[PDB]
């Protein structure tokens, strides 16, 4: 008699979470873990926290209490004191006692998974955002013994190495950039994975894996990730990294003598990078992130141009500026296409005689017309209200890490030197890259702006706002990203610089640039 | 790079034990030798209401094997030693039913909480001889599957039918399955005693040993309550008889005794030693010593060829297991005798004898076997043994052999019967009508035509009567000479050679001994 067997229950996963100074990331990080599409009754939690300067253990304790009954089991190993290691130089310094402790901890979680008869153990670093709720299911689907999902960072850094040096050190290989950029998809054999990975405790070879102590043959640096990677070689366990689709994001590690504020702002940029192409990563419905209070970054006004019909560009920028604690005045963009020929003449608008597109040879467009009038209105607002220094934003731009501190420290450097400036580029397209642009003395990270090509973000002074308006550019209409290089006298074509007489604009540019385009 | 093999599935073995010290050495030994990784095996043991030292045997064993297994849970309860609503140790009251259901439910919750793949229930007196039984059960990929355990009777750990009220039901399919005529895994409405639950299956979440399903309207029986639970869960129960798995004692009545259970499980060990080597106990438990008596006889002989070492070791184990002591008599190899030594004893075949089956005359094997019995008949008269039991070396002992045989001889001597021979093992040739019973002596009948000499009781008066006929000059096989002496041999040509056939012969009814191979 045939009788159908019911389905197998999902694999039994232990999620091991080591947390130190993670209160900045846990609301977003733990919310992502809650919403993993894996049955919570087939999931167990293992949490260890210690050496905390922030209220990391308090956030964890509240979250665990809220989700304890949903899971197969929960282990909780806090240690309030000491808040820092006796042999450390700072919270971001990986001393030997911190290496040893974290190794011992991962080993304890590994043993705990073995003792509770779990199929898999999943390590997730407290600052690792597992955005894809299917990541755990997808990693189980690969039937590997140690597999890791390639997480995206702001740079080439990711949670895997492509080469090793037979001494344990990092090593670039030609295949890293292809894997990193997902040009080659799949799962690849690599000598190193870290941060987040899945161990298959069904595999018999996993019984020989060990986070601590180092293997008896280990003769490398006292590094936690190196000790484990060497343990996979001895057990002949091939580590794999998969990039078949997007899984999550992670911040790039900081230097030893960095600070907790660096780390909190570093993870905030991760949230920004997510919001470039995704909705904002939501927090847990049981953890609440602290309320932020913004400012104008010491400016007289921070503008943001936006066309009302581009509603999704508006919400994205407001979420990004809010997350960076930056306040803006929304300026309605001049819809250049909605202006008939009569309203164009009503403002004395005439294209510059003989203008041709640098890459197609076309006259000025209605889009570039409405774009020039948008910046033209802001220049009018600057002169009317007498704002001495203002920052101007557009609606499609991504922010660099530590954007707020980095620009504010330039503005306190430009001010302390009494620089006679009109236009400071926060984001442009540098067109003169043969010889380097002349650096501005006594003001670090600032150069004299040569021929640029964009107006994504810039600082303008009241002096510069009058200079632009006094050149009456409405009758000599030229796209705004070319009219500015005409005003500081670095435009390549001289048939354009001839129509404008006085071109005494003091233009500078932040170096490196603090803002880039979204879709480049 | 090649992925390593998967580990074996995680199995929790659940063991309820009450008054099982008689079986735990042999039973626990069978489990510790299961071909299934101990690191992938966990133990769950609960014991209570013990009148024997069951609790001490388990603790002695668990302490010795704790370090070898993934986990060990241990639930003992010394007081009380019996249920307040019971009529005896073998009576299943509602408190006993309720407690046993709670223990199995507790074992199921344990298996679930420790994330085991399977839970294997094994009754404390179930001898899982086959070390691969666990592996085989897992292989069938069933949610509730049981191995068919052999018993001395038609009883096994499954039913083929069930009534609309939850009672046992015979079906035409039970016997073919029970005798391994139809081999395979069959869907049945009831399995118990030893079975495997697949906790990987989502349906197993709905199984519960306790409490009964809210629709349960049947009797408060532990196995039926579980059976109805799988019905509500739509989980099909299976039993597999593809090969020999293990052995099971047949349950006893509510008013049976502990010694009945102890001796009933001993018979399981005897049954194993028929076609299999002896079932060894755990090398971590000391089996209790046994004191053998002569069962009140003046002597117990065992005939055996010195060359048949295999038969000797098997009998000396079955006897020692039953606390029976025998004097070993070396048989006379009638095949190693040349034609000169045959005449040296004054031996002549009875004129005209031939085998009633293939027509052969008396054989050399049938010669020395008569002489071995002939030499024992002499030692009886020489030593003056009033009552003696005579054994051979290919015997199958019935259940409760020692007590049933002693009770018979006690019923005989208290009645003063003029007896000379009492068969204990034989082939009854009168099968049309039952043989004439002996009044006032239960389980004893007058021996009609019989045909074996497996084992028998012989008196001094009867030991003289055989030798008085002087049979060496007119020799038949010894199993045909006796029916001549009590005058039941159908051949009047043979009986005509013996002038006085005055032997008074009897037999136990039913027989207590049968051959190893029929
Ligand atoms: O004493 C400690 C130190 C760290 N952690 C926790 O362990 C993880 C370490 O992640 P960090 O962000 O603090 O460290 P990095 O981002 O700089 O990168 C890390 O990548 C690996 C972790 O996956 C190795 O730990 C490596 O040495 C280390 O540089 C985090 O979950 C952190 O919260 C602790 O619980 N206790
Ligand atoms: O209070 C108790 C009563 C029983 N048992 C245990 O229950 C198991 C089965 O009991 P028995 O072998 O003594 O009883 P049976 O031989 O008659 O076989 C049983 O077969 C089924 C499955 O075991 C049911 O339990 C049924 O009630 C019963 O007949 C044994 O391991 C016994 O040790 C206990 O641990 N504690
Ligand atoms: Ca990190
Ligand atoms: Ca039993
Ligand atoms: Cl430094
Ligand atoms: Cl320093
Ligand atoms: Cl804002
Ligand atoms: Cl113990
Ligand atoms: Cl049978
Ligand atoms: Cl029955
Ligand atoms: Cl003996
Ligand atoms: Hg690679
Ligand atoms: Hg590794
Ligand atoms: Hg430093
Ligand atoms: Hg705003
Ligand atoms: Hg059947
Ligand atoms: Hg059942
Ligand atoms: Hg003996
Ligand atoms: Hg014989
Ligand atoms: Hg028997």
Short mmCIF file of C-alpha atoms in Angstrom, two decimals, chain A residues 7-310:
data_model
loop_
_atom_site.label_atom_id
_atom_site.label_comp_id
_atom_site.label_asym_id
_atom_site.label_seq_id
_atom_site.Cartn_x
_atom_site.Cartn_y
_atom_site.Cartn_z
CA UNK A 7 7.52 16.83 4.12
CA UNK A 8 10.74 17.01 6.08
CA UNK A 9 11.02 19.88 8.52
CA UNK A 10 13.52 22.60 7.64
CA UNK A 11 17.16 22.14 8.71
CA UNK A 12 18.05 23.09 12.28
CA UNK A 13 20.18 26.25 12.28
CA UNK A 14 22.00 27.84 15.21
CA UNK A 15 22.57 31.56 14.64
CA UNK A 16 25.66 32.52 16.65
CA UNK A 17 26.01 36.26 17.31
CA UNK A 18 29.07 37.82 18.94
CA UNK A 19 28.36 41.46 19.82
CA UNK A 20 30.74 44.15 21.09
CA UNK A 21 29.96 47.87 20.77
CA UNK A 22 27.16 47.08 18.31
CA UNK A 23 24.23 49.16 19.62
CA UNK A 24 24.52 51.30 16.48
CA UNK A 25 23.91 48.33 14.16
CA UNK A 26 21.68 45.98 16.16
CA UNK A 27 18.26 47.58 15.36
CA UNK A 28 18.89 47.15 11.63
CA UNK A 29 21.01 44.01 12.04
CA UNK A 30 18.71 42.10 14.38
CA UNK A 31 15.58 43.10 12.47
CA UNK A 32 17.10 41.48 9.39
CA UNK A 33 17.73 38.28 11.36
CA UNK A 34 14.14 38.15 12.69
CA UNK A 35 12.75 38.32 9.16
CA UNK A 36 14.90 35.50 7.79
CA UNK A 37 12.61 33.13 5.90
CA UNK A 38 13.59 30.05 7.89
CA UNK A 39 11.24 28.51 10.48
CA UNK A 40 12.02 30.01 13.87
CA UNK A 41 11.17 26.75 15.63
CA UNK A 42 13.95 25.17 13.54
CA UNK A 43 16.21 28.07 14.55
CA UNK A 44 18.14 28.57 17.77
CA UNK A 45 19.92 31.66 19.09
CA UNK A 46 23.38 31.87 20.65
CA UNK A 47 24.43 35.34 21.82
CA UNK A 48 27.57 36.49 23.63
CA UNK A 49 28.44 40.09 24.49
CA UNK A 50 31.19 41.66 26.60
CA UNK A 51 33.65 44.57 26.75
CA UNK A 52 30.89 47.05 25.93
CA UNK A 53 31.21 50.83 26.05
CA UNK A 54 27.73 51.41 24.62
CA UNK A 55 24.49 49.81 25.82
CA UNK A 56 24.90 46.84 23.48
CA UNK A 57 23.94 44.25 26.11
CA UNK A 58 20.83 46.24 27.04
CA UNK A 59 19.64 46.31 23.41
CA UNK A 60 20.36 42.59 23.05
CA UNK A 61 18.64 41.73 26.34
CA UNK A 62 15.44 43.53 25.30
CA UNK A 63 15.45 41.96 21.84
CA UNK A 64 16.06 38.45 23.19
CA UNK A 65 13.21 38.77 25.70
CA UNK A 66 10.94 39.87 22.86
CA UNK A 67 11.83 36.97 20.54
CA UNK A 68 12.73 34.24 23.06
CA UNK A 69 9.46 32.30 22.80
CA UNK A 70 9.61 32.16 18.99
CA UNK A 71 12.82 30.11 18.85
CA UNK A 72 13.82 26.53 19.66
CA UNK A 73 16.22 27.80 22.34
CA UNK A 74 18.24 30.86 23.32
CA UNK A 75 21.65 31.01 25.01
CA UNK A 76 22.74 34.30 26.58
CA UNK A 77 26.31 35.03 27.73
CA UNK A 78 26.78 38.64 28.85
CA UNK A 79 29.72 40.12 30.73
CA UNK A 80 29.31 43.73 31.85
CA UNK A 81 32.82 44.36 33.18
CA UNK A 82 35.52 45.08 32.15
CA UNK A 83 34.38 47.39 29.35
CA UNK A 84 37.75 47.23 27.56
CA UNK A 85 40.66 44.80 27.37
CA UNK A 86 43.66 45.43 29.67
CA UNK A 87 46.05 44.98 26.71
CA UNK A 88 44.13 47.06 24.14
CA UNK A 89 44.90 50.50 22.73
CA UNK A 90 41.29 51.32 21.87
CA UNK A 91 37.87 49.80 21.20
CA UNK A 92 38.80 49.11 17.56
CA UNK A 93 42.22 47.59 18.36
CA UNK A 94 42.45 43.82 17.90
CA UNK A 95 44.87 42.89 20.67
CA UNK A 96 45.89 39.30 21.39
CA UNK A 97 43.54 38.98 24.37
CA UNK A 98 40.68 40.12 22.12
CA UNK A 99 41.75 37.67 19.41
CA UNK A 100 41.88 34.85 21.95
CA UNK A 101 38.52 35.70 23.51
CA UNK A 102 36.63 35.97 20.22
CA UNK A 103 38.22 32.71 19.05
CA UNK A 104 37.15 30.97 22.26
CA UNK A 105 33.64 32.40 21.86
CA UNK A 106 33.13 31.18 18.29
CA UNK A 107 34.41 27.81 19.50
CA UNK A 108 31.87 27.84 22.33
CA UNK A 109 29.08 28.55 19.85
CA UNK A 110 30.44 25.80 17.59
CA UNK A 111 30.39 23.35 20.50
CA UNK A 112 26.94 24.54 21.58
CA UNK A 113 25.63 23.84 18.08
CA UNK A 114 27.17 20.36 18.15
CA UNK A 115 25.72 19.56 21.58
CA UNK A 116 22.17 20.61 20.60
CA UNK A 117 22.33 18.46 17.43
CA UNK A 118 21.89 21.30 14.94
CA UNK A 119 22.37 20.75 11.22
CA UNK A 120 24.00 24.14 10.60
CA UNK A 121 25.59 26.97 12.54
CA UNK A 122 25.36 30.48 11.06
CA UNK A 123 27.74 33.17 12.27
CA UNK A 124 26.55 36.74 11.66
CA UNK A 125 28.77 39.62 12.75
CA UNK A 126 26.77 42.14 14.74
CA UNK A 127 27.36 44.84 12.10
CA UNK A 128 26.45 42.54 9.17
CA UNK A 129 23.11 43.36 7.54
CA UNK A 130 21.58 40.21 6.01
CA UNK A 131 19.17 42.10 3.76
CA UNK A 132 17.95 39.16 1.64
CA UNK A 133 15.56 37.14 3.86
CA UNK A 134 16.35 34.06 1.71
CA UNK A 135 20.12 34.13 2.31
CA UNK A 136 20.07 31.32 4.87
CA UNK A 137 17.90 29.10 2.66
CA UNK A 138 20.11 29.87 -0.34
CA UNK A 139 23.29 28.98 1.57
CA UNK A 140 21.81 25.65 2.69
CA UNK A 141 20.87 24.99 -0.94
CA UNK A 142 24.53 24.84 -1.98
CA UNK A 143 25.35 21.72 0.08
CA UNK A 144 28.79 23.01 1.05
CA UNK A 145 30.53 22.43 4.37
CA UNK A 146 31.68 26.04 4.87
CA UNK A 147 29.90 28.55 2.63
CA UNK A 148 29.70 32.34 2.89
CA UNK A 149 27.41 34.83 1.12
CA UNK A 150 29.37 37.64 -0.56
CA UNK A 151 28.32 40.81 1.25
CA UNK A 152 28.70 44.19 -0.45
CA UNK A 153 30.76 47.02 1.02
CA UNK A 154 31.37 50.61 -0.04
CA UNK A 155 34.70 49.48 -1.55
CA UNK A 156 36.39 46.39 -3.00
CA UNK A 157 36.44 44.90 0.52
CA UNK A 158 34.21 41.90 1.14
CA UNK A 159 34.07 38.92 3.50
CA UNK A 160 36.41 36.71 1.45
CA UNK A 161 39.98 36.54 0.18
CA UNK A 162 40.87 35.22 -3.26
CA UNK A 163 44.52 34.42 -2.55
CA UNK A 164 46.71 33.54 0.41
CA UNK A 165 50.46 33.89 0.81
CA UNK A 166 51.41 30.51 2.34
CA UNK A 167 52.21 32.67 5.36
CA UNK A 168 48.57 33.66 6.07
CA UNK A 169 48.57 37.19 4.66
CA UNK A 170 46.09 38.69 2.22
CA UNK A 171 46.86 38.33 -1.48
CA UNK A 172 45.22 39.86 -4.55
CA UNK A 173 44.50 37.51 -7.45
CA UNK A 174 43.07 38.46 -10.87
CA UNK A 175 39.74 36.75 -10.09
CA UNK A 176 38.82 38.90 -7.07
CA UNK A 177 37.45 41.96 -8.89
CA UNK A 178 35.28 39.79 -11.22
CA UNK A 179 33.77 37.93 -8.25
CA UNK A 180 33.45 41.15 -6.25
CA UNK A 181 31.53 42.86 -9.08
CA UNK A 182 29.32 39.79 -9.75
CA UNK A 183 30.53 39.61 -13.35
CA UNK A 184 31.24 35.95 -12.56
CA UNK A 185 28.34 34.45 -10.60
CA UNK A 186 28.25 31.16 -8.74
CA UNK A 187 30.06 29.68 -5.75
CA UNK A 188 33.85 29.72 -5.83
CA UNK A 189 36.51 27.86 -3.88
CA UNK A 190 38.47 30.41 -1.85
CA UNK A 191 41.09 30.14 0.91
CA UNK A 192 39.33 32.58 3.26
CA UNK A 193 35.82 33.59 4.29
CA UNK A 194 34.76 35.48 7.40
CA UNK A 195 32.11 37.74 8.97
CA UNK A 196 29.08 35.65 7.94
CA UNK A 197 29.23 32.01 6.93
CA UNK A 198 27.36 28.73 7.31
CA UNK A 199 28.93 25.52 8.63
CA UNK A 200 27.35 22.18 7.69
CA UNK A 201 27.43 20.12 10.89
CA UNK A 202 25.85 17.22 9.02
CA UNK A 203 29.12 16.85 7.09
CA UNK A 204 31.51 14.43 8.79
CA UNK A 205 34.47 16.66 7.97
CA UNK A 206 33.01 19.48 10.09
CA UNK A 207 33.75 17.43 13.23
CA UNK A 208 37.43 18.37 12.79
CA UNK A 209 36.83 22.12 12.44
CA UNK A 210 37.86 24.28 15.38
CA UNK A 211 38.00 28.02 16.06
CA UNK A 212 40.29 27.61 19.09
CA UNK A 213 42.99 26.57 19.87
CA UNK A 214 45.05 26.79 16.67
CA UNK A 215 45.74 23.49 14.91
CA UNK A 216 48.88 21.72 16.21
CA UNK A 217 50.57 22.50 12.87
CA UNK A 218 49.51 26.17 12.87
CA UNK A 219 52.53 28.49 12.64
CA UNK A 220 50.94 31.75 11.49
CA UNK A 221 49.87 35.03 13.09
CA UNK A 222 47.53 35.01 16.09
CA UNK A 223 44.57 36.06 13.94
CA UNK A 224 41.10 34.61 14.49
CA UNK A 225 40.12 34.35 10.82
CA UNK A 226 43.51 32.89 9.90
CA UNK A 227 43.34 30.26 12.65
CA UNK A 228 39.97 29.08 11.36
CA UNK A 229 40.91 29.15 7.67
CA UNK A 230 43.90 26.96 8.50
CA UNK A 231 41.54 24.62 10.36
CA UNK A 232 39.53 24.09 7.16
CA UNK A 233 42.70 23.21 5.22
CA UNK A 234 43.64 20.50 7.73
CA UNK A 235 40.11 19.06 7.76
CA UNK A 236 40.26 19.39 3.94
CA UNK A 237 37.09 21.50 4.03
CA UNK A 238 36.89 23.78 1.00
CA UNK A 239 35.54 27.22 1.89
CA UNK A 240 33.18 28.70 -0.70
CA UNK A 241 31.86 32.20 -1.37
CA UNK A 242 28.65 32.65 -3.38
CA UNK A 243 27.59 35.80 -5.22
CA UNK A 244 24.71 34.41 -7.28
CA UNK A 245 22.56 37.27 -6.00
CA UNK A 246 22.63 40.09 -3.48
CA UNK A 247 22.61 38.92 0.13
CA UNK A 248 23.54 41.83 2.37
CA UNK A 249 25.95 44.61 3.25
CA UNK A 250 28.67 45.23 5.82
CA UNK A 251 30.87 48.18 6.83
CA UNK A 252 34.56 48.29 5.98
CA UNK A 253 36.64 47.71 9.14
CA UNK A 254 38.37 50.71 10.72
CA UNK A 255 41.92 51.19 11.95
CA UNK A 256 43.14 50.23 15.41
CA UNK A 257 43.27 53.83 16.68
CA UNK A 258 39.75 54.62 15.43
CA UNK A 259 36.78 55.54 17.62
CA UNK A 260 33.26 54.29 18.23
CA UNK A 261 31.84 57.34 16.44
CA UNK A 262 33.76 56.30 13.33
CA UNK A 263 32.08 52.90 13.59
CA UNK A 264 28.57 54.26 14.17
CA UNK A 265 28.93 56.60 11.20
CA UNK A 266 30.54 53.82 9.12
CA UNK A 267 27.48 51.60 9.58
CA UNK A 268 25.25 54.59 8.82
CA UNK A 269 26.88 54.83 5.39
CA UNK A 270 25.94 51.17 4.87
CA UNK A 271 22.32 52.19 5.43
CA UNK A 272 22.88 54.93 2.85
CA UNK A 273 24.33 52.50 0.29
CA UNK A 274 21.27 50.27 0.75
CA UNK A 275 18.96 53.23 0.09
CA UNK A 276 20.61 53.91 -3.29
CA UNK A 277 18.86 50.96 -4.96
CA UNK A 278 16.58 49.58 -2.20
CA UNK A 279 14.02 50.81 0.30
CA UNK A 280 15.63 51.65 3.64
CA UNK A 281 16.48 48.58 5.69
CA UNK A 282 13.85 48.50 8.44
CA UNK A 283 14.73 47.91 12.11
CA UNK A 284 13.26 45.26 14.39
CA UNK A 285 9.69 45.71 15.55
CA UNK A 286 11.09 45.23 19.08
CA UNK A 287 14.21 47.45 18.92
CA UNK A 288 13.95 51.21 18.41
CA UNK A 289 16.92 53.12 17.03
CA UNK A 290 17.76 56.35 18.91
CA UNK A 291 16.14 59.56 17.72
CA UNK A 292 18.48 61.77 15.70
CA UNK A 293 18.59 65.57 15.80
CA UNK A 294 19.79 67.31 12.60
CA UNK A 295 21.33 70.70 11.86
CA UNK A 296 22.38 72.84 8.90
CA UNK A 297 26.01 71.69 9.43
CA UNK A 298 26.87 75.26 10.37
CA UNK A 299 25.64 76.63 7.04
CA UNK A 300 23.31 79.58 6.64
CA UNK A 301 21.09 77.33 4.51
CA UNK A 302 21.22 73.90 2.87
CA UNK A 303 19.21 73.75 -0.35
CA UNK A 304 18.00 70.68 -2.25
CA UNK A 305 16.62 71.10 -5.77
CA UNK A 306 13.91 68.62 -6.76
CA UNK A 307 11.28 68.33 -9.48
CA UNK A 308 7.93 67.55 -7.87
CA UNK A 309 7.10 64.74 -10.31
CA UNK A 310 10.30 62.93 -9.24
#
